[PDB]
Design a protein around this ligand. Structure first.
Ligand SMILES: O=P(O)(O)OC[C@H]1O[C@H](OP(=O)(O)OP(=O)(O)O)[C@H](O)[C@@H]1O
Ligand SMILES: O=P(O)(O)OC[C@H]1O[C@H](OP(=O)(O)OP(=O)(O)O)[C@H](O)[C@@H]1O
Ligand SMILES: [Mg+2]
Ligand SMILES: [Mg+2]
Lengths: 344, 347
């Protein structure tokens, strides 16, 4: 017997929800039955009552149960995501994704256009000439032909639009900011997942563990929702349904310390210029961070196998990410991705 | 540069607002400039952070600054309110309403404030209508009622038309929020004294702080059974507000010879049932309902007495109980309700 008064009442009492309550709430939102006030109340209360992995998993599962799927047998078993919660990072994630795909690891990303001038995943890709708004059959064909696909959230999650509007109206991060990485409709089993919210990274890791994903959930100790080069990073390594928390230092692999002012994401047009520069062989702090993050995604991919060893997996990941840039394979993959969109 | 992201961000970080921020928010809400999502976010966030008296006082201040006032010099300086937050989840008779009539009949001017029920079968305003009292009079006529009858009723929707945006969000989300505190703090006649019920034990102290800041003489009451009234089934917690300060007491009616009642004996019904119960009490029916009415009327009289620095607690209660009982026993309360009904029918 579920209801808003009951569910919101329980959250304002600072109590974890009973099993299925988060799911009921998200289903109401997804079926268009929740008024904007109810959506907003739920998002704030869930946020101020620290969400648990069970609750966030319930929200993401309901969202996925409403999403358009990709066609049967079109997503490889070892596809990876590279994505962060933001709250930015999109330049790094996007470049790293292209590098990973160029290395031979299939990548399927998922995202929105940004509400600000600060680019979303989608905005930077469009600036580079990639057609981001394609239907399931064409994303599958992209993945097969180019090695990478992008699922536009507005297209694959049409029932989420009311929630999206509420989030923009309240304008501050909530539990819904966690769901991007957890609601990729291609359902990749691996990924490098950035989380800006240090206290919630462990929660996201828990959700991925329940799904038997091989993921590195990463939080830069300088706040970045990516593996940073300015200092150490905290990694929640997810494999075989378990989570190990680690401190990671890229200097151990010979990466120079950089400054934060050098790495943050900006608008889509500037992100686009930075992509072209890095993929064209420009050296410096941005390249290093892209390489490190690409390697991280390759390591997560390697973890799909029970016989993967941490330090050797990192060394291979770094070699592969560097080579994908240095040979021009990453630059050529982007060009082939642009051409894909222009040829139907 | 105040904004919703700023204010909501601060509340969701579990931080108290800066001075002026709650006021800014409430003012956006009252002028129709707040989206429903923003209203609901604000109400919920503030509730979970734990509102301060400064914050709640700002909200109520903004409401009062937008309300229709009564004409100048028409509200006596010692007028009292008898009103509560509601939301106690018990279907009780309209104890504040019955106590208000008794208090007015004892000679203390009363200006009540209210709406038609949120989640009981019958609110104070619904029960008054069923008795034949006109609830929806304007400022001039409320002031005239106060002068001619000794009591007036300010219909919350009539006096706070701009609250409609907040009210609708409250109804949509259902859960109690800080907004549930505002009714008793926003009587448009601005009485300086009152017996104020609070269903939410954790927020009563906050309400008491708001009244202390305005230099009101108020008893903020929470029955330890959960009632937003002085109860007869058990003890009540009272936050006594006098001289700009608050002190917390526990009140036991056994100390004044009241027998313990059971909660189901104070149960009410629809507006006709509760109207019938008002008629029975004013007519001299003895029993648990009368006891609770007499106790609550006495509490409002004690609050009124506290407008003087000289008032002492136990003498005040004894006087209040004598006055409340006499007002019923002499027929003064029954006659005042009749005179109130007649006043309204004569336009
Ligand atoms: O606010 P939203 O539209 O929901 O998007 C949140 C994040 O998702 C995208 O990141 P990306 O996928 O590039 O990962 P990254 O942030 O780790 O670069 C976008 O650039 C934001 O950083
Ligand atoms: O939920 P709302 O519509 O905001 O109203 C809250 C309370 O206001 C009235 O109480 P009051 O103490 O004035 O009257 P009663 O005790 O006589 O019922 C009403 O009867 C509710 O109890
Ligand atoms: Mg009451
Ligand atoms: Mg009550």
């Amino acid at each position: 017997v579920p209801s808003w008064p009951q569910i919101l009442g329980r959250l304002t009492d600072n109590r974890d929800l009973a099993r299925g309550q988060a799911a009921w709430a998200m289903d109401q939102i997804m079926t268009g039955n929740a008024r904007p006030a109810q959506i907003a109340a739920f998002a704030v209360a869930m946020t101020m009552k620290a969400p648990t992995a069970d609750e966030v998993g319930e929200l993401a599962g309901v969202m996925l149960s409403h999403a358009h799927p990709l066609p049967a047998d079109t997503v490889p078993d070892d596809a990876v995501d590279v994505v962060g919660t933001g709250g930015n990072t999109v330049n790094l994630s996007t470049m790293a994704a292209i590098v990973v795909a160029a290395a031979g690891v299939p990548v399927v990303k998922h995202g929105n256009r940004a509400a600000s001038s600060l680019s979303g995943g989608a905005d930077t890709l469009e600036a580079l000439g990639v057609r981001i708004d394609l239907g399931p059959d064409l994303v599958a064909r992209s993945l097969a032909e180019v090695g990478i696909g992008f699922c536009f959230a507005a297209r694959f999650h049409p029932s989420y639009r009311h929630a999206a509007a509420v989030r923009r109206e309240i304008g501050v991060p909530t539990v819904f900011n966690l769901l991007g990485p957890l609601t990729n409709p291609a359902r990749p089993r691996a990924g490098l997942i950035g989380c800006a919210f240090a206290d919630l990274a462990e929660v996201m890791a828990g959700v991925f563990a329940a799904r038997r994903s091989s993921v590195l959930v990463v939080h830069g100790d300088d706040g970045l929702d990516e593996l940073t080069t300015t200092t150490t990073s905290t990694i929640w390594r997810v494999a075989a349904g378990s989570v190990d928390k680690l401190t990671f230092d890229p200097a151990g692999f010979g990466f120079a310390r950089a400054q934060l002012d050098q790495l943050a994401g900006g608008d889509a047009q500037a992100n686009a210029a930075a992509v072209r520069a890095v993929l064209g062989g420009a050296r410096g702090p941005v390249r290093d961070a892209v390489v490190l993050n690409a390697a991280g995604a390759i390591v997560a991919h390697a973890g799909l196998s029970s016989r993967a060893e941490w330090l050797p997996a990192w060394e291979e990941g770094l070699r592969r990410a560097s080579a994908a840039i240095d040979t021009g394979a990453a630059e050529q993959l982007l060009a082939r991705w642009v051409r894909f969109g222009r040829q139907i």
